[PDB]
Amino acid sequence: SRYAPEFREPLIDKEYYRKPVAELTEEEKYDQELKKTQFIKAAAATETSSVFADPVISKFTNMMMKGGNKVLARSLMAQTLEAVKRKQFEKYRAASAEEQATIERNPYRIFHEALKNCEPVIGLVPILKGGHFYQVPVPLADRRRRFLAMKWMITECRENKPRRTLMPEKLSHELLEAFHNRGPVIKRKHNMHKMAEANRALAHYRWW
Amino acid sequence: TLNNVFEPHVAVRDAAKMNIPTVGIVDTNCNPCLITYPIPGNDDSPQAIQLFCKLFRTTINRAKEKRRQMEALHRLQSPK
Amino acid sequence: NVQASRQESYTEDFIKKQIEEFNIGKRHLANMMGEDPETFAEEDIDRAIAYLFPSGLFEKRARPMMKHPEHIFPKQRATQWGEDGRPFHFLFYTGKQSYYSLMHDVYGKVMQLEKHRAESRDLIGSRWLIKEELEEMLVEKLSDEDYAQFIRLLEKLLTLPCGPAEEEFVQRFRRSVTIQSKKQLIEPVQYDEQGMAFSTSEGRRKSATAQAVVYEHGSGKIHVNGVDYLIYFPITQDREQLMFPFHFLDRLERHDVTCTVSGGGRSAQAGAIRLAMARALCSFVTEDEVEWMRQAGLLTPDPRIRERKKPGQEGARRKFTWKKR
Amino acid sequence: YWKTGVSAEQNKHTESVLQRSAAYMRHLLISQQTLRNVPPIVFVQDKRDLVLAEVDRLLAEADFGPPHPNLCGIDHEALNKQIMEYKRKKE
Amino acid sequence: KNRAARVRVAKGNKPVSYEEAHAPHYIAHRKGWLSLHTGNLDGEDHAAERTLEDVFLRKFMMGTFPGCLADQIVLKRRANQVDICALVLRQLPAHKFYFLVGYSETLLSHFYKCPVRLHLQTVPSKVVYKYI
RNA sequence: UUGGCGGUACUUUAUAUCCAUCUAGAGGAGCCUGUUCUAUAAUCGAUAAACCCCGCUCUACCUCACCAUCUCUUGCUAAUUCAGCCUAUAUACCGCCAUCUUCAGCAAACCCUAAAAAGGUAUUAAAGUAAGCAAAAGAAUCAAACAUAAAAACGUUAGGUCAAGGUGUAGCCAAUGAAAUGGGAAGAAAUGGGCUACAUUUUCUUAUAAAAGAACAUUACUAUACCCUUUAUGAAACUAAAGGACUAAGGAGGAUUUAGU
Ligand SMILES: [K+]
Ligand SMILES: [K+]
Ligand SMILES: [Mg+2]
Ligand SMILES: [Mg+2]
Ligand SMILES: [Mg+2]
Ligand SMILES: [Mg+2]
Ligand SMILES: [Mg+2]
Ligand SMILES: [Mg+2]
Ligand SMILES: [Mg+2]
Ligand SMILES: [Mg+2]
Ligand SMILES: [Mg+2]
Ligand SMILES: [Mg+2]
Ligand SMILES: [Mg+2]
Ligand SMILES: [Mg+2]
Ligand SMILES: [Mg+2]
Ligand SMILES: [Mg+2]
Ligand SMILES: [Mg+2]
Ligand SMILES: [Mg+2]
């Protein structure tokens, strides 16, 4: 890295800086005073104070990008969100007043609740004990649990789709199916959890 | 004459190797064999150490003063 | 039976002759350069030598020098005993007469304070002298354990009641700390022929360089290279990068910017403008806000630049395939 | 380290209790003169035990959903090609 | 291990001059260039001919002053003038140097068709930078 | 007693690294290229880690050192019963490097031991000490830092190179030397590396990587092969490029394995 270890990650929260001084906890108040005598990293090209920037969706975009084609990957995510909004508007208009209440037309809220439905609480680590490969039930961190949900989505759509279907049409159809706990990405989570019960007694081999 | 690990100070043997005479206070647990002029006595008490320090200090100053006087008397005789 | 050139220790007569030759040198160097010998100074000497003996060696220790002998010749500990052979200092046979002479003084001070019997922060923003600095004061070399013990003894002195004599003593072994000012330098505010206020600042991202000209009063009209910003930047992410400076300070639609970005690609040019606008926009915001910008990454130049390729490997870090065995 | 029963909740309470009396426990040993200079004491749970308990907590919370040549070690196929290739040269 | 132009370490009894002590990576950092011409500057011609002439000029001076050279020679080209600056030990009588200077200048001026001058600074003995 | 070893324990540990984690690849297909093998009248060297687009930042003649045929015998120089030799030995070497390695040691002068084959530390200090080389620092990437490069001793592998050049020993001198002409083939067989494709985050067109209109499985995606034309260099096209047809295989690659903070 070209940043020395003494550099601090930038804080790009607009409201945080403009809060009244008394509203800030003394711990936060102390850090701000310390940061005045430190070096701050430059903000990333994609780090902005925009009110429409969601870290979860921005991360999902980077996991789809191939060869640094951010314009294409962002376009694919923009087309997906729109394909989900247009799919719920059609259902909402073609539904009764009672049914209309339940229907969710926010694509950003369908994406977050979809991913969370696919996240697995426990995973598996492959281990070779006595020249035999065993996978031991592991408890997954918040970072490993989130990564696996996004990875499983980007892999079901990339591979298990018809040749002429497009990613905005497969991903939209999968975010909505996961949003209802019916999709194949949810089935992957159910299989992972079910296998952990099979290897329930083999967690002892853990050394880490 | 002992170091802080209860062993003879290295300079006792090294002063014998160089043929340097040694005046040492030697308590009951010490080894006086290589001390040229051993002085049996207490080495731990502050009042004992303070006495020896004064004796060695008064003695050395007297001997240095005597030399100054001895030189002046003999030197003065040369013109006189 | 080792045969190498011995240390050419410098006596006082030697250094004294080296100072007479230097004093005669200055009078000649002054006569050459047409300057007055009386006023000729060390700074003028270095300038004269650099003109008359141009050297382009990167290391400046290897360049020609005509310095006063004190600067060049290492000052050396003098003889530690007289003609009769009696060492001058009573702690000579310790081998560290100057380190132990100092530890003798501080231990005697500590004893008098403890026998004889307020806030101890008489000095703030100060540090203890580093081992290299202490060694110079004593004119001898110390170990890490020797330095650590000296500090522990000095700390004990501060803990105890200290008269003004002690405070002056510990002061000699305290070096003033300079806390670097990590605060932005505000730009000037020029005025146009029309009379409108505006500030200018440059920005650099990767190989792109920008020169923004923010105006105090505007409707949010940003023109890049004489073109609009929607036309110049057809990508949303590049426009979002131009929005970050103003949106952060809730100053959207209040300034008119004229940019000139040359070099780099689409993303590097937007980033370069972002920094240039943030630095120009400093002149029109409060100092609390300027610190708010600095702590959000808007005023730091990004040092990440393309790395060179290395011979013998595919890329800057990519290595050629390790062939199968 | 102290032995840790299966019940996670009780272990958490026991951990706090022991830790509060850590200073007094040290005093008791130092006072009795069994050990003259005892340093500060800590009470820790075996990480192996904690993980095994966590792998059980998450498992309960988790939802299981709705109800030939390479065997011997000689590449007989490759060796056949080497022999047939030699036979092609012979013939 | 790199071997180029590196005088290696022995037991601290090997005298080395300043030029010999410094390895190739110190060129332009601690020690300069022995030859100074304009043929390696950007957009300049006749580098090969300046380099070939230097190789010969160094072998010529070594043989013409056998055992009398304290250090490598320095070649300085200005316009069509060539200047050879050599540190030479004080072994030979003074009049012998005057013969070799007149001879080496005339011979090298009629061989390369340029004015060649020889500059000799006599040292009492080789100057030792360090013992390695 | 020292070192090496231990399917002997107990602690540290590796930072793109031993396991785990992450991304794109190799391993399958077609080509380009090296090596081996086969093989040719027909070079040489490199050839576990540390060879295998390696000496070559480069072989149509030349280059060339190889093979076949023909020819020359004081045969490049001022002189020389001399010229010349890519003849043998890198296990005689210089020169210039690989490797452990960005590893932390190497060597020399002293001093000490109820003798020493060796070893020599304790910091509230007990026999170790004062200097060199490496490291460090410094300099380079034209502010600053970080990073990257460079740097990296002494040894280890009789490591690589007598074919860069030079050179010790031995060998040829009407030939192992010099010159001319024509040749130096072949696989498709194993293997190393690379390139391209297998497509939908794709295919073609205009723009410019924004956007739009078409294409989208039997020949759609898709050959930098073979073949057929034209052009460039040259004396020579056997070479390279650009078009044209023609289509094959390829449907994301077993064991295993490379690189990246
Ligand atoms: K060699
Ligand atoms: K091949
Ligand atoms: Mg006693
Ligand atoms: Mg790359
Ligand atoms: Mg690895
Ligand atoms: Mg392959
Ligand atoms: Mg060989
Ligand atoms: Mg040929
Ligand atoms: Mg030929
Ligand atoms: Mg031959
Ligand atoms: Mg060898
Ligand atoms: Mg270095
Ligand atoms: Mg060998
Ligand atoms: Mg030869
Ligand atoms: Mg050979
Ligand atoms: Mg496009
Ligand atoms: Mg087609
Ligand atoms: Mg032609």
Layout of SSEs?
This is part of a larger assembly, with chains A (208 residues), B (80 residues), C (325 residues), D (91 residues) and E (132 residues).
Chain A: E1 7-8, H1 14-18, H2 26-35, E2 39-40, H3 55-64, H4 70-93, H5 97-102, H6 107-118, E3 122-128, E4 133-139, H7 142-159, H8 167-179, H9 184-198
Parallel strand pairs in A: 1-2
Antiparallel strand pairs in A: 3-4
Chain B: H1 10-17, E1 23-26, E2 37-40, H2 46-77
Parallel strand pairs in B: 1-2
Chain E: E1 15-16, H1 18-21, E2 35-36, H2 47-64, E3 74-78, E4 81-89, H3 94-112, E5 116-123, E6 130-131
Parallel strand pairs in E: 2-3, 4-5
Antiparallel strand pairs in E: 1-6, 3-4
Helix pairs in contact in E: 2-3
The complex binds potassium ion (2 copies) and magnesium ion (16 copies).
One magnesium ion is lined by residues 27, 29, 43-44 of chain B.
Chain C binds one RNA strand of 261 nucleotides through residues 1-2, 4, 7, 57-62, 95, 143-146, 148-149, 234-235, 266, 303, 307-308, 310, 313-325.
Function (chain B): Required for mitoribosome formation and stability, and mitochondrial translation.
Family (chain B): Belongs to the universal ribosomal protein uS2 family.
Subcellular location (chain B): Mitochondrion
Report on the structure:
- This is part of a larger assembly, with chains A (208 residues), B (80 residues), C (325 residues), D (91 residues) and E (132 residues).
- Chain A is mainly alpha-helical and 208 residues long.
- Chain A has helices spanning 14-18, 26-35, 55-64, 70-93, 97-102, 107-118, 142-159, 167-179, 184-198; strands at 7-8, 39-40, 122-128, 133-139.
- Chain A has a two-stranded parallel ribbon.
- Chain C has 11 helices and 9 strands.
- In chain C, strands 3, 4, 5, 6, 7, 8 and 9 form a 7-stranded mixed sheet that branches.
- Chain C is extended, with a radius of gyration of 32 Å.
- By secondary structure, chain D is mostly helical.
- In chain D, 64% of the residues lie in helices and 0% in strands.
- Chain D is built from 5 helices and no strands.
- Chain D has helices at 8-20, 22-32, 47-61, 69-72, 76-90.
- Chain E has helices spanning 18-21, 47-64, 94-112, and strands at 15-16, 35-36, 74-78, 81-89, 116-123, 130-131.
- A 4-stranded mixed sheet of chain E has the order 2-3-4-5, with helices on one face. In chain E, strands 1-6 form a two-stranded antiparallel sheet.
- The interface between A and C is medium-sized, with 28 and 33 residues.
- Residues 27, 29, 43-44 of chain B line the site of one magnesium ion.
- Chain C binds one RNA strand of 261 nucleotides through helix 6.
Task: Write the element-wise H/E pattern of chain C from the N-terminal end onward.
Answer: HHHHEHHHEEEEEEHHEEHH
Rg from Cα of chain C:
32 Å
- SS-derived structural category of chain E: alpha/beta
What is the end-to-end distance of chain C?
Answer: 53 Å
Query: Sheet with the most strands of chain C?
Result: 7 strands, mixed
PDB class: ribosome
Keywords: biogenesis, mitochondrion, ribosome
Entry title: Assembly intermediate of mouse mitochondrial ribosome small subunit without mS37 in complex with RbfA and Mettl15
Chain A: 28S ribosomal protein S7, mitochondrial
